[PDB]
């Protein structure tokens, strides 16, 4: 006999994210075999962990994947990156590209620096991560009072620096209208501890490539659409 | 008690291919017995494998089921069939008739040639299948550089030639607007290796019947409707 039904108040509604399927109109069809394929990946996090380039500003305000250093120790940081997946600095990194499609993140961030100067060039940098609350570090004295690692040049070319996940909340926002304590987490500044030093016949300026990616315990969640824009 | 239901956004839609049945309005009815019947077949592929006639052009542009050969060896192929189930050449074969109602095919194709000349007539043909990429074969030298079989006349009247399924894709289109690498697969050309030879009192022209069908490992898939036309 027919079953009595109570039509809910949302009849006919199309839920773009309902966790259910719809009617198949061309079933019993074989999906063209692709067993020969390679390169498949199943988690978008894989992408977030691939170190990608940061956009630094050239002397002519042009965007370049590195910063310069020479035979001197500035009283100010060579570069300053605000730790937000919203930083214009990492706007075109795979990390940010993926994060733009998610609401929150959690975990470590890896800032990879690759020294491209000559083999004869030496020097030491102090990479610091300053948590918020007391503002951006104004001096080396302040920067070294927070989380930091000293990078010494030599045989190995790069330094993998991790910005520890230090937050009042378990998750942090990927973007924001105005900075809040849940969307902005401090700064990463790299200072010149000792001047880049070298012999004669070597260009005064050395270029350090800069990249970012999510660390080992980095995660993103809540799929969303980012603010649309016109390509150019 | 009545069951709460969520009416999906497609209510009332008639799906011509839904894999489900509808309400029976005259059940408990016996289907007039037909156990005495013979000739039943359950797969349309059966039809595709029955060798059927190709349409060759007569000297007056009329369509005939054969081509001519005589006491000479032309520098050009006697016939040329582009391997596409869309070939106008096989347009009225059962193979093409069935294929027109399917989207893709895969597997061998059998081109059957039946010599109808006199018993006193001899000769050899070189049947070649040239895969695409370098265009149609212009000479016997080019044709014999691809897949081919030499057909020698004698006691047995016909030659069953197979066009191997050589494709970049697992399946190939049955038809097309413009030829693509997934809908056109080369050419089958039959050449005169040695001239047809015979004694006096024998007509100079011999007729070779030409047929096509799907091979042993031939299959079709995805039921569709072909471009309609007005019979005439």
């Amino acid at each position: 006999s027919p079953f009595p039904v109570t039509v809910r108040e949302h009849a006919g509604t199309f839920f773009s994210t309902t966790p259910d399927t719809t009617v198949p109109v061309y079933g019993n069809t074989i999906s063209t075999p692709f067993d020969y394929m390679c390169g498949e990946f199943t988690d978008l996090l894989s992408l977030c962990k691939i170190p990608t380039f940061l956009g630094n500003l050239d002397s002519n305000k042009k965007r370049i994947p590195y910063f310069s250093a020479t035979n001197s120790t500035p009283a100010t940081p060579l570069v300053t990156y605000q730790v937000t997946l919203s930083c214009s600095c990492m706007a075109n990194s795979m990390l940010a590209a993926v994060a733009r499609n998610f609401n929150q993140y959690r975990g470590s961030l890896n800032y990879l620096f690759v020294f491209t100067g000559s083999a004869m060039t030496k020097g030491k940098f102090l990479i610091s991560y300053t948590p918020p609350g007391a503002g951006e570090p104004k001096t080396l004295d302040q920067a070294m009072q927070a989380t930091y690692a000293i990078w010494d040049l030599g045989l190995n070319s790069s330094y993998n620096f991790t910005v520890p996940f230090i937050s009042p909340t378990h998750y942090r926002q990927t973007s924001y209208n105005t900075p809040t304590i849940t969307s902005v987490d401090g700064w990463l500044t790299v200072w010149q501890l000792t001047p880049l030093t070298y012999p004669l016949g070597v260009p005064n300026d050395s270029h350090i490539l800069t990249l970012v990616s999510g660390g080992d315990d980095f995660t993103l969640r809540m799929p969303v659409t980012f603010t649309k824009y016109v390509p150019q | 008690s009545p069951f709460p239901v969520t009416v999906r956004e497609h209510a009332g839609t008639f799906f011509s291919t839904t894999p489900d049945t509808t309400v029976p309005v005259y059940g408990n009815t016996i289907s007039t017995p037909f156990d005495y019947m013979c000739g039943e077949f359950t797969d349309l592929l059966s039809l595709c494998k029955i060798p059927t006639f190709l349409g060759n052009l007569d000297s007056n542009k009329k369509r005939i089921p054969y081509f001519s050969a005589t006491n000479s060896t032309p520098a050009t192929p006697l016939v040329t069939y582009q391997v596409t189930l869309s070939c106008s050449c096989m347009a009225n074969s059962m193979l093409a008739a069935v294929a027109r109602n399917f989207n893709q095919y895969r597997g061998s194709l059998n081109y059957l040639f039946v010599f109808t000349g006199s018993a006193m007539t001899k000769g050899k043909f070189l049947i070649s299948y040239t895969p695409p990429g370098a265009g149609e074969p212009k000479t016997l030298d080019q044709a014999m550089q691809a897949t081919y079989a030499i057909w020698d006349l004698g006691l047995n009247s016909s030659y069953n030639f197979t066009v191997p399924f050589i494709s970049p894709t697992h399946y190939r289109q049955t038809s097309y607007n413009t030829p693509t690498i997934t809908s056109v697969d080369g050419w089958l050309t039959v050449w005169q290796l040695t001239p047809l030879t015979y004694p006096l009192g024998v007509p100079n022209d011999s007729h070779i019947l030409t047929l096509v069908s799907g091979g042993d490992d031939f299959t079709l898939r995805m039921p569709v409707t072909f471009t309609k036309y007005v019979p005439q």
């Binding site: 006999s1 027919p2 079953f3 009595p4 | 029976p24 059940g27 408990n28």
Partner: peptide, 24 residues
Amino acid sequence: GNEGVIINNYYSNQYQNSIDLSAN
């Protein structure tokens, strides 16, 4: 007669149909 449904009737047999009873 014209009972071709697999699943049992949603309504009790005593409600869906008249109750047949013998007076003897």
